[PDB]
Design a protein around this nucleic acid. Sequence first.
RNA 1: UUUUUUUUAAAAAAAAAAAAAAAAA
RNA 2: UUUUUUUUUUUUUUAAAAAAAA
Lengths: 371, 118, 147
Amino acid sequence: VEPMDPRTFVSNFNNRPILSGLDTVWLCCEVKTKDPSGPPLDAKIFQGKVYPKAKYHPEMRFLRWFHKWRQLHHDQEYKVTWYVSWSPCTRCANSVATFLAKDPKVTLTIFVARLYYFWDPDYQQALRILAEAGATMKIMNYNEFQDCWNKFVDGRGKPFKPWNNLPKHYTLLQATLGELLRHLMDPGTFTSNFNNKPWVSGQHETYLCYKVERLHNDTWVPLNQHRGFLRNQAPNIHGFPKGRHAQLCFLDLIPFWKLDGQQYRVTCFTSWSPCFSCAQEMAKFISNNEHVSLCIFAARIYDDQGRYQEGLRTLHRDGAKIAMMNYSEFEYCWDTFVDRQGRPFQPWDGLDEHSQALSGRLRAILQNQGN
Amino acid sequence: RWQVMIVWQVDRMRINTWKRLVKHHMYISRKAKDWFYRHHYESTNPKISSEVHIPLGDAKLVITTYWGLGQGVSIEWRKKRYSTQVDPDLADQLIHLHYFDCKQIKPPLPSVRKLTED
Amino acid sequence: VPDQRSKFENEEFFRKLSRECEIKYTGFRDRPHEERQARFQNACRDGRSEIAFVATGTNLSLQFFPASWQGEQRQTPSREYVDLEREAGKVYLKAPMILNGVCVIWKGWIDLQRLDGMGCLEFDEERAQQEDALAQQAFEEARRRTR
RNA sequence: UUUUUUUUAAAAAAAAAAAAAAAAA
RNA sequence: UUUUUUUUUUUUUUAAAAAAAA
Ligand SMILES: [Zn+2]
Ligand SMILES: [Zn+2]
């Protein structure tokens, strides 16, 4: 391994969604067999131009280097890993996906620092084509960054120091990769957590299903490019990542789309109720943002003597449209945000009984304020 | 309804040179200090990359730049809710004879016929 | 109107624009054709889609947008229409557009099986005075001066 | 006339720290 | 990589004050 740019990779691989003033797309790949326990065969770091040219991109560097390597090496199954500073380009994506469909042996794992041009359909369709070709594309976390610093950075013995606002940008980028790649939750975790049979075993981690409409002059019309499941992050998986409760990333991701002054509502199919340490932020956020109303459908009411009644009252009073999950909303959550592969929605025992019991609890807890 | 817009169809490379030159002339240099660059998110149309607004006196030329069509350009002329589509020669004439001066520079000046090279 | 008609016979782009061009639909080309015709039928029957008509010079393309996309319901441009019930087996496109100093109605026909067709332009003298602001004189003053 | 200390503002680079980057600002 | 700011200093310019010496 020849390590290039020790210091510029701090603010060149910078986990920040919007970052201008750059000229270089970096690529830091490595090749391996089917067994990852063995040592790598080779690992060469490439540097392709950004807007300079499409023919001399880092992807084309990788395509040319794989060609020159494979005419001089044995043909076998390869498990290649990337660490790219941007996401692939339209032309690059539409050629790299062709290259993956040409050879079934080579299996990429494109790790990206920042997503390149996630807000236009011309790039989004190219990224969807690349991901459907068979390259599992994931936003880089702390561990992949540590791997990049350990292998492909000429460190002087110094360890990788993560910059300020790494995990906030990580969840801000993962929840738009999950919405730009049509990522849908498995049926198994849906029937594990989202079912509203009461908490006796399992179901430790809350989930989410957000959905954005427009409220046009005619009527409401949904946007299709802002839709996904935003599960809450694991709490301090190694201390440094911020453990966000009550889908904080949703409220924090609210302004990330640069929402227009056009008023509308956002649907939040939470598999719990917003707690006292997560609903006051919601009430303040719907206070200072008058244009966005935030309607909520909850599977089970959070009750742990956490004084949730005051938070729910001040959440409803400001203008949030909290309701409770029925078979219509459960059917929508199975139809849209879950990769059902054609299988229809199956209900459980006491769907309407539990739904009306929990909605009666919502009436008895919410509506009694001031008699 | 079926509200009508004309479109000059052009590839991503020329449209990206157009965006690069217009933001370089508003921000890096002071030639275009009065020009507006309405962003993609301020446009409620789903097929708009940008709206370069060029204030010509009390009027305002609009160069809307589109998405997912390659890409497309459309030149308007708005003054008190009155629109008017404008061909690139007239837009070039209005830009050069209202704003700029009169040869190749490392940033070429923003010309809509260099955009619509075809 | 008279000087408007004189400059209407003077524009250089108007020679190409009103020569009864061969307009074609450039939509989903890599897909099957029959489904292109079917999607033309859905798009001309739905309310949320765009349709693009390209001349032979592959530079100009008229595009129709739904009025809810901009979020402006203007009453006076309502004459734009996509007619199918007028004649069988042929779709007609009508669009009143204010091009440069003049207000011209674009009229075209396009076969549902050829997906290609004929397009042309026509002066309508109603929009000369229906524009209440009528900044065509200011437009005229702006377009004639030269440094 | 010379020397030591404090203060009001600026200048060349530096480390302390933040915000905008909608992408060749 | 770059613009806009906050807080502290190194050397210089200017002004004011306290002390010592000729
Ligand atoms: Zn690329
Ligand atoms: Zn919580």
